[PDB]
Structures are given as C-alpha cells and as structure tokens.
C-alpha cells in the first residue's frame, strides 16, 4: 500500500515505454500474433485470439504452434467452427489436453452465431458475460488484443513480473494479492497499445523474468524493479563495494585518463 505501488506517472510512462520498445524488437514470432495483427475484420481477429488463448491455457507454447495453424486452416472463422461436428473438433484437439476446453470453444462459436448475430462482444465484461468458459483473463486478452480496449491482464507470467517489480511477497493465491496485481496491471496497461502491452508483460515473464535464474541484465525494466534494486544493494553490501582516490593528494593535478589500475600500457611502476 506504498512502496508496492506506482505512485508517479513519470514512472508508469517509463515502464510502458521500456517494455513496449523491448517487445517491438525481441518478441517471439508466433502465428497467432501474426494472424491477429494482420486480420482487419475484428470478428475474425477476435476469434483468432480466442482460439490461441484457449489453446495456451492448458498447454506449452511450443506445442500450440503445431495445432494452432492446422486449426485456423480448417476453421478460419467463428462461422466455420460453428458448423463443425464434435468428432472433427476432438481430432483437431487431440494432444492439447482436456477436451472439454475444446468442446467449449466450439459451443462458444456456435453460441456467437446463433444468439449474437455472429458478432464477438466488444468489451472485456461483455465478453466474460456472454462466452462460455471465458474468464477475466481470456476476456481481457481478447478485448485488449483484438479491440484495443485498455484493460490490463494478469496470468502467471505477469504475476511473477509484477511481484518482483513491486516486491510483493505475500501469498499470490491470496485474494488481497490477486486483487492488488490486477490493480497494478490495470494501472500499467498502455492506453494507446493495450494489446501489445499485455503481450509484452506476459512475454517478459516467459522469456526474461523466468521462474528460475531470471535475465535481469537483459531486462528492459531492471531500473524500476524493486526486487532487482534490493539484491543489487545486497550484492554491494556482500562484497565491500564503495571518482579518483589517489588524486585528493593533489595541488598540481595528475593525468585524467585514470590513474593506473591499470596500469594497462607501458606505464608503471615508477617507484
Ligand atoms: S530486473 Fe529481473 S526480477 Fe526485475 S522485472 Fe526484470 S527479470 Fe524480473
């Protein structure tokens, strides 16, 4: 409720800018990110994001690549999926884990066609209210990615990042903590590029700020990372870490390419 929040706008702005520019240059190339950014029809775009999200929920990225492409190949739109049989879905789903998520995705498409005029609802709340199995996270991913709605989202990856960035050590499954992370995400989400921001936060968690041995030296957000600052302060305190020192013994002043140490070049030792 203090040092665990983003008190100054300037900092929010720096977090957004660093994360997004890192993302624009380092993000992995994934078929759903490509499809989504290239699709100009919002209903097809939202469906494409929806499928990838359901697929990613119970399975690793590496395997979703294989299935995602084949799935969209066969059913590139809500309408196409709406008229597939249960048996066809099972075959295309085989290897993605719990089948019901897949059956539920197809029944979702069918509901959109038969009760909603084929239109994907355009807001996170509306998307959560209407589509079966679509929770707060998936609704937010579709709305921010497909529609540009400024809604922040928190999955495991973002949670790991935010817990470190604001040094939150309380049990994350706690209700107070979840609500705090969601609050942070909602405050951080970039109003102009909320989709990329969400994808960037997740990507950071998946690539740089990993469960183990995180790549803090390559992290675009190291400066604003409360956990990082703390370990840096400890590392200095653990070694004896302490702007020329020999020089204070001046009058006539010695040279300004640092005195030696080194001591690199033909100089020294001049007893
Ligand atoms: S500096 Fe390290 S702990 Fe902090 S956000 Fe980056 S990867 Fe995570």
Instruction: Name the residue ranges covered by the structural domains of the chain.
Output: 1-28+150-242, 29-149
H or E segment at 97?
none
Print burial letters for 134-169: b (CB count within 10 Å at least 16), e (below 16).
beebbbbbbbbbbbebbbbbbbebbbbbbbbbbebe
Residues annotated within a binding site: 209, 216, 219, 225
Angle at 48 between CA 45 and CA 53, to 5 degrees: 125
Return the best residue to mutate from 6, 23, 164 for the ligand 1 pocket (most ligand atoms within 8 A of CB).
164
The CATH fold assigned to 29-149 is: Endonuclease III; domain 1 (1.10.340)
- Quote the CA–CA distance of 161 and 176 in Å, as a whole number: 17
Q: How far is the CA of 159 from the centre of ligand 1 (A)?
A: 12
Closest CA relative to residue 184, chosen from 203, 164, 211: 164
- Quote the CA–CA distance of 110 and 81 in Å, as a whole number: 7
Closest CA relative to residue 195, chosen from 150, 159, 162, 154: 150
Per-residue tokens: 8: 């100054």
Question: Residue 53 catalytic?
Answer: yes
DSSP string, 170-219: S-TTSHHHHHHHHHHHHHHS-SS-HHHHHHHHHHHHHHTS-SSS--TTS-
Q: How far is the CA of 223 from the centre of ligand 1 (A)?
A: 9
Q: How far is the CA of 31 from the centre of ligand 1 (A)?
A: 27
Provide, for the chain, the percentages of residues in helix, strand and coil under a 3-state DSSP scheme, each rounded to the nearest 5.
Answer: 60, 0, 40
- Quote the CA–CA distance of 133 and 223 in Å, as a whole number: 38
- Quote the CA–CA distance of 235 and 189 in Å, as a whole number: 32
Residue bearing tokens 């709605």: 149
Report phi then psi at 152, rounded to 5: -80, 155
The catalytic position among 11, 26, 53, 261 is 53
What architecture (CATH level 2) is domain 1-28+150-242?
Answer: Orthogonal Bundle (1.10)
Measured CA distances, 10 to 6, 21, 229 (Å)? 9, 17, 18
- Quote the CA–CA distance of 47 and 79 in Å, as a whole number: 10
Q: Is the CB of 227 under 6 A from ligand 1?
A: yes
Q: Is 5 helix (H, G, I), strand (E, B) or coil?
A: coil
Per-residue tokens: 115: 């009760």
**Is the distance from CB of 94 to CB of 66 less than 8 angstroms?**
no
Q: How far is the CA of 34 from the centre of ligand 1 (A)?
A: 27
Per-residue tokens: 68: 């995602």
Residue bearing tokens 């992370």: 181
- Please list, in sequence order, all residues whose beta carbon lies within 8 angstroms of the beta carbon of residue 21, skipping any fewer than 6 positions away: 220
Residue bearing tokens 């994001």: 49
Q: Is the CB of 165 under 6 A from ligand 1?
A: yes
**Is the distance from CB of 205 to CB of 161 less than 8 angstroms?**
yes
Technique behind this structure? X-ray
- Quote the CA–CA distance of 123 and 143 in Å, as a whole number: 6
Residues annotated within a binding site for [4Fe-4S] cluster: 209, 216, 219, 225
| Cited resolution, angstroms | 2.3
Angle between helices 136-146 and 42-57 (to 10 degrees): 140
Q: Is the CB of 225 under 6 A from ligand 1?
A: yes
Per-residue tokens: 142: 């579709």
H or E segment at 57?
helix 42-57
Report phi then psi at 171, rounded to 5: -50, 110
Per-residue tokens: 214: 């995180």
Examine residue 263 and say whether the peptide bond preceding it is cis (omega within 30 degrees of 0).
Answer: yes
């Amino acid at each position: 409720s203090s040092y665990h929040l983003f008190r100054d706008v300037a900092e929010v702005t720096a977090f957004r800018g660093s994360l997004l520019s890192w993302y624009d240059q380092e993000k992995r190339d994934l078929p759903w990110r490509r499809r989504a950014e290239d699709e100009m029809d919002l209903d097809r775009r939202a469906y494409a994001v929806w499928v990838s999200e359901v697929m990613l929920q119970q399975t690793q990225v590496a395997t979703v690549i294989n299935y995602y492409t084949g799935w969209m190949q066969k059913w590139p739109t809500l309408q196409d999926l709406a008229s597939a049989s249960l048996e066809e879905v099972n075959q295309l789903w085989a290897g993605l884990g719990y089948y019901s998520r897949g059956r539920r995705l197809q029944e979702g498409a069918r509901k959109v066609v038969e009760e909603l005029g084929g239109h994907m609802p355009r807001t996170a709340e509306t998307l959560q209210q209407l589509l079966p199995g679509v929770g707060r996270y998936t609704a937010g991913a579709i709305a921010s990615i497909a529609f540009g709605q400024a809604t922040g989202v928190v999955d495991g990856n973002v949670a790991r990042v935010l817990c470190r960035v604001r040094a939150i050590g309380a049990d994350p499954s706690s209700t107070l903590v979840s609500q705090q992370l969601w609050g942070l995400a909602q405050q951080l989400v970039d109003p102009a590029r909320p989709g990329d921001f969400n994808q960037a936060a997740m990507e950071l968690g998946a690539t740089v700020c990993t469960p183990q041995r995180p790549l803090c030296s390559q992290c675009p957000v190291e400066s604003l990372c409360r956990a990082r600052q703390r370990v840096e302060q400890e590392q200095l305190l653990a070694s004896g870490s302490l702007v020329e020192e020999c020089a204070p013994n001046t009058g006539q002043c010695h040279l300004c390419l640092p005195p030696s140490e080194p001591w690199d070049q033909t100089l020294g030792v001049v007893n």
